[PDB]
């Protein structure tokens, strides 16, 4: 059925238990943005 | 002695320009990584023309 509506689905949908996993990479870490930070001593470029 | 040092002059000087385009390159005393000279900063995929001025 549809928990949003309550009407069922035209076709059937497979389900059941499956083994899955949360991989290392998490946006909680990777995601970043800066405005004005430090720069490479040589040329005034930013830092990766 | 003269020719010895007078020649070592050409090799050292030219090593400060392009290190290793003539003869085995000179590396930090006793270790590994060959000193990056003037011409060594320009060429290469990481050359200043690329890693800095054509993208940064």
From Swiss-Prot, chain A:
Domain of life: Bacteria
Subunit structure: The RNAP catalytic core consists of 2 alpha, 1 beta, 1 beta' and 1 omega subunit. When a sigma factor is associated with the core the holoenzyme is formed, which can initiate transcription.
Protein family according to the UniProt entry: Belongs to the RNA polymerase beta chain family.
Function of the protein: DNA-dependent RNA polymerase catalyzes the transcription of DNA into RNA using the four ribonucleoside triphosphates as substrates.
Name assigned to this protein: DNA-directed RNA polymerase subunit beta
UniProtKB/Swiss-Prot annotation, chain B:
Family stated for the protein in its record: Belongs to the RNA polymerase beta' chain family.
Function field: DNA-dependent RNA polymerase catalyzes the transcription of DNA into RNA using the four ribonucleoside triphosphates as substrates.
Subunit-structure text: The RNAP catalytic core consists of 2 alpha, 1 beta, 1 beta' and 1 omega subunit. When a sigma factor is associated with the core the holoenzyme is formed, which can initiate transcription.
Name listed for the protein in its UniProt record: DNA-directed RNA polymerase subunit beta'
Interval of the full protein contained in this chain: 566 to 621 of 1524
């Amino acid at each position: 059925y549809d928990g949003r509506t309550g009407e069922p689905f035209e076709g059937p949908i497979v389900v059941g238990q499956m083994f899955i996993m949360k991989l290392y990479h998490m946006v909680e870490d990777k995601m970043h943005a800066r405005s004005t930070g430090p720069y490479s001593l040589i040329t005034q470029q930013p830092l990766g | 002695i003269i020719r010895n040092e007078k020649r070592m002059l050409q090799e050292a000087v030219d090593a400060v320009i392009d290190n290793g385009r003539r003869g085995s390159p000179v590396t930090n005393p006793g270790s590994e990584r060959p000193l990056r000279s003037l011409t060594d900063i320009l060429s290469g995929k990481q050359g200043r023309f690329r890693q800095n001025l054509l993208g940064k």
